[PDB]
Automatic annotation (TrEMBL), chain A:
Family: Belongs to the adenoviridae penton family.
Protein name: Penton protein
Organism, scientific name: Lizard adenovirus 2
Main localisation: virion
Function in brief: Major capsid protein that self-associates to form penton base pentamers, each in the shape of a pentagon, situated at the 12 vertices of the pseudo T=25 capsid. Involved in virus secondary attachment to host cell after initial attachment by the fiber protein, and in endocytosis of virions. As the virus enters the host cell, penton proteins are shed concomitant with virion acidification in the endosome.
Subunit structure: Interacts with the fiber protein (via N-terminal tail region). Interacts with the capsid vertex protein; this interaction binds the penton base to neighboring peripentonal hexons.
Upregulating conditions: Expressed in the late phase of the viral replicative cycle.
Range of the intact protein held here: 102 to 401 of 451
Source domain of life: Viruses
GO cellular component, one term: T=25 icosahedral viral capsid
TrEMBL record, chain B:
Induction profile: Expressed in the late phase of the viral replicative cycle.
Subunit structure of this chain's protein: Homotrimer.
Stretch of the intact protein here: 254 to 303 of 909
Domain of life according to the entry: Viruses
Organism: Lizard adenovirus 2
Cellular compartments annotated: Virion; Host nucleus
Protein name as catalogued: Hexon protein
């Protein structure tokens, strides 16, 4: 009812010996319920790869071509600016803010949906109609490559052959300096170039999503307000006798009993869903943020 | 329709019952009278009272 489940993602679904596949805009969905940003970004990645299983893999596309992934952790935390790789060989397993990693020709739409408010991204102009976070819009701020444990005295090794044949699509802009093809919304926000700062904003993840005001309307006893009219007799427009904020507040919880508790859960209740890429180092199980906002319903 | 059916050969037939379907006398039921749910209004403008 409140339009917070269904959206578009523009996933690549064709293999034509690559050169030019058709991208084919389509609409996604997710089942309704009482969700939290830790548990939802587990299953909103499931909503992406749900249409991978009956159009993507039934066409012939490569396994490591999942277009839109909703990530939580910051890349380039162990990355020193002198050596263009990340130093410990693994991206830091700790979530800061939920963002979006993408591929070429692969956006995400937020026109008729309200998941952007409950993921933690908005515009800086709330009055323009609709926006698509396309590729080449978050320009600057590629995810870097990595270094392996072996042969590090002697070579630098941006190699991509380790995750069971999944290719990282690493890039070489500068000689001996290495980036990849993926582009995150966090690294494109604090980028040295910019151009995403001018139209996007960081905010609280906001599990409510900023619900609209709830109007009271009662024609049969109250005289109308200053500019309203009696005769419309519609369920849409009525003489409003008062507004207030929709009674759906947030309860906070925070712990040092964080993301390690998620590792204890997936050892139990034996489960391979939500975790179709356990060893990709990009499409892994994303870390929970250290605080979860629980949405309750106080009587107003 | 069939009035008695045994085999595809031997079966009697009878026409369907005549079912005249039209509007009511005086077009009753076209309009919501006697309603607080669907109440039509003849209200003046500027003094909007019903």
């Amino acid at each position: 009812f409140f339009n917070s489940n269904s959206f578009k993602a523009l996933l690549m679904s064709d293999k034509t010996d690559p050169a030019n596949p058709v991208y084919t805009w389509f609409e996604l969905s997710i089942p309704e319920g009482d969700y939290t940003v830790g548990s939802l970004i587990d299953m909103l990645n499931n909503a992406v790869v749900e249409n991978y299983l009956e159009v993507g893999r039934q066409k012939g596309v490569q396994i490591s071509d999942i277009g839109v992934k909703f990530d939580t952790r910051n890349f380039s935390l162990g990355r020193d600016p002198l050596t263009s790789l990340v130093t410990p060989g693994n991206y830091t397993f700790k979530a800061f803010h939920p963002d979006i990693v993408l591929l070429p020709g692969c956006g995400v739409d937020f026109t008729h949906s309200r998941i952007n408010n409950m993921l933690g991204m908005r515009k800086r102009f709330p009055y323009e109609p609709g926006y698509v976070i396309t590729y080449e819009d978050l320009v600057g701020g590629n995810i870097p490559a990595l270094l392996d444990l072996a042969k590090y005295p002697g070579e630098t090794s941006p190699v991509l052959q380790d995750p069971d044949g999944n290719s990282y699509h690493v890039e070489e802009v500068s000689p001996k300096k290495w980036q990849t093809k993926y582009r995150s919304w966090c690294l494109a926000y604090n980028s040295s170039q910019g151009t995403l700062k001018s139209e996007q904003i960081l905010t609280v993840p906001d599990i409510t999503g900023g619900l609209g005001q709830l109007y009271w309307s009662l024609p049969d006893a109250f005289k109308p307000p200053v500019t309203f009219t009696n005769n419309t007799t519609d369920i849409s427009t009525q003489p409003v006798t008062g507004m207030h904020l929709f009674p759906l507040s947030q309860r906070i919880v925070y712990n040092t009993s964080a993301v390690y508790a998620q590792l204890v859960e997936q050892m139990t209740n034996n489960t391979k869903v939500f975790n179709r890429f356990p060893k990709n180092a990009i499409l892994m199980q994303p870390p929970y943020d250290t605080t979860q906002w629980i949405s309750e319903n106080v009587p107003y | 329709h069939f009035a008695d059916f045994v085999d595809d050969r031997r079966a009697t037939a009878a026409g369907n019952r005549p079912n005249y379907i039209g509007f009511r006398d005086n077009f009753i039921g076209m309009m919501y009278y006697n309603s607080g749910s669907n109440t039509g209004s003849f209200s003046s403008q500027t003094q909007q009272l019903n």
